[PDB]
């Protein structure tokens, strides 16, 4: 692809984080801690899942960023409305304000309702995310496989400002401790 010139510097918003997440000093990395991280609760924090939002809000234009997923077994990535539900159980779908893909149990799927099987020959170590607000597009790219297309959500109805969205996943197996990292431009 040729989206690299729309690169944006994303940082993580600590206030939105699940209380077990550990975000690095530079706000560019996040991982699952083995306990509560000693923060107060608030109405913004994701309660049920190890999720966090980027600080940046997008309401126009074209945006691109990259995320490192090396040696993770489970994660969700994409964008979401600023006003997505934070508390309780919910599914990642456009109806609920999410445009996401994920890895789970050795398969990759797009967060449609119901979910869509992805066809990935080269397991990605870094994912590129492109948003065209005006066109209503969210696209995902396999940076490990020379930028090959993973998935495009088109005819998106964003219906609000967008925020970068992350889920580091649970670590019940002991094999999913590794962080998500925002990759440098
Ligand atoms: C699930 C849920 O609604 N949690 C909640 C709501 C309001 C406040 C204020 N401080 N901590 C809170 C936690």
UniProtKB/Swiss-Prot annotation:
Lineage top rank: taxon: Eukaryota
Keywords on record: Cell cycle, Coiled coil, Cytoplasm, Cytoplasmic vesicle, DNA-binding, Metal-binding, Nucleus, Ribonucleoprotein, RNA-binding, Transferase, Ubl conjugation, Ubl conjugation pathway, Zinc, Zinc-finger
B30.2/SPRY domain mapped to chain residues: 8-185
Main location group: cytoplasm
GO terms, molecular function: DNA binding; RNA binding; ubiquitin protein ligase activity; ubiquitin-protein transferase activity; zinc ion binding
GO cellular component, one term: autophagosome
GO biological process: negative regulation of innate immune response; negative regulation of NF-kappaB transcription factor activity; negative regulation of protein deubiquitination; positive regulation of autophagy; positive regulation of cell cycle; positive regulation of protein binding; protein autoubiquitination; protein destabilization
PTM entry text: Autoubiquitinated; does not lead to its proteasomal degradation. Deubiquitinated by USP4; leading to its stabilization. Autoubiquitinated.
Induction: Up-regulated by IFN.
Cell compartment(s), UniProt: Cytoplasm; Cytoplasmic vesicle, Autophagosome; Nucleus; Cytoplasm, P-body
Function summary: E3 ubiquitin-protein ligase whose activity is dependent on E2 enzymes, UBE2D1, UBE2D2, UBE2E1 and UBE2E2. Forms a ubiquitin ligase complex in cooperation with the E2 UBE2D2 that is used not only for the ubiquitination of USP4 and IKBKB but also for its self-ubiquitination. Component of cullin-RING-based SCF (SKP1-CUL1-F-box protein) E3 ubiquitin-protein ligase complexes such as SCF(SKP2)-like complexes. A TRIM21-containing SCF(SKP2)-like complex is shown to mediate ubiquitination of CDKN1B ('Thr-187' phosphorylated-form), thereby promoting its degradation by the proteasome.
Subunit structure: Homotrimer. Component of a SCF(SKP2)-like complex containing CUL1, SKP1, TRIM21 and SKP2. Interacts with CALR, CUL1, FBXW11, HSPA5, IKBKB, IRF3, SKP1 and VCP. Interacts with SKP2; the interaction with SKP2 does not depend on an intact F-box domain. Interacts (via N-terminus and C-terminus) with DCP2 (via N-terminus and C-terminus). Interacts (via C-terminus) with IRF8 (via C-terminus). Interacts with ULK1, BECN1 and with ATG8 family members, including GABARAP, GABARAPL1, GABARAPL2 and MAP1LC3C/LC3C. Interacts with TRIM21 and SQSTM1/sequestosome 1. Interacts with IRF3.
Family: Belongs to the TRIM/RBCC family.
Record remark: domains: The coiled-coil is necessary for the cytoplasmic localization.
Protein name per Swiss-Prot or TrEMBL: E3 ubiquitin-protein ligase TRIM21
Species, as recorded: Mus musculus (Mouse)
Span within the parent record: 291 to 468 of 470
């Amino acid at each position: 692809h040729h989206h690299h010139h729309h690169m944006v510097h994303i940082t993580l918003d600590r206030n939105t984080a699940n209380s077990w997440l550990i975000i690095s000093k530079d706000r560019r990395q996040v991982r699952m801690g083995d306990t509560h991280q000693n923060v107060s609760d608030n109405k913004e924090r994701f309660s049920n899942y190890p999720m966090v939002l980027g600080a940046q809000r997008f309401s126009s234009g074209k945006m691109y960023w990259e995320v490192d997923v090396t040696q993770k077994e489970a994660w969700d990535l994409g964008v979401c409305r600023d006003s997505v539900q934070r508390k309780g159980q919910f599914s990642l779908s456009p109806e609920n304000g999410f445009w996401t893909i994920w890895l789970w149990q050795d398969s990759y799927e797009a967060g449609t309702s119901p979910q869509t099987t992805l066809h990935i020959q080269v397991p990605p170590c870094q994912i590129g995310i492109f948003v065209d607000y005006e066109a209503g597009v969210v696209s995902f790219y396999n940076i490990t496989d020379h930028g090959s297309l993973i998935y495009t959500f088109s005819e998106c109805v964003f219906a609000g400002p967008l925020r970068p969205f992350f889920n580091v996943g649970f670590n019940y197996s002991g094999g999913n401790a590794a962080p998500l990292k925002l990759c440098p431009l």
